[PDB]
Amino acid sequence: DAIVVPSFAPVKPRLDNTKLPLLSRAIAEQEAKARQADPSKPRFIELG
Amino acid sequence: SVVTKSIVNADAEARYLSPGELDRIKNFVSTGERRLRIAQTLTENRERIVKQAGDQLFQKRPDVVSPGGNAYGEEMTATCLRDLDYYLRLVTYGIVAGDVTPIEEIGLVGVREMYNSLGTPIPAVAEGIRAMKNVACSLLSAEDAAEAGSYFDFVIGAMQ
């Protein structure tokens, strides 16, 4: 009386992205470049 | 220009333009619009830049504008500022071309002959062009100011 294929269970992935190598490089770059000086702008010493 | 310099060196080899040289042409042609903008800003404020350079140059070197100097009297002072204006025009040409060959051709070949014949002090001219560099760079954005500094720097380096 049992159902061999009851239903297909969703799975929560163990490996969280934005820790994966490519995004991690990119996240580092966007953060660090934002904190650094900005090209093509008149005022840059004013910004915190 | 970048195009003519690359073509001339390739002509020395007689080879058709190398892939790297063609890529250089691609880069220059692609960034041409930004170059046009830099030249446009400098020529739009050409009057202010030139006059401020005159003020600063005379202040660093009062002896050129003192009595017994080349720039004594309104007419002589005006001719000195006209020379500064000519070199600013040359700098805009060089920015647009992307190479310093136009600046060299029009104004820098034989400048020592011309200026000492006129009696004008070449090192003082160099200080004036340095003032032009500072004023123009202040008007320009940081990215634009870096390139314009190079074009001014050839002029001052030749003057020495």
TrEMBL record, chain A:
It is found in: Cellular thylakoid membrane. Belongs to the phycobilisome linker protein family. Belongs to the phycobiliprotein family. This is Phycobiliprotein ApcE. The gene is apcE. The chain holds residues 893 to 940 of 1139 of the full protein.
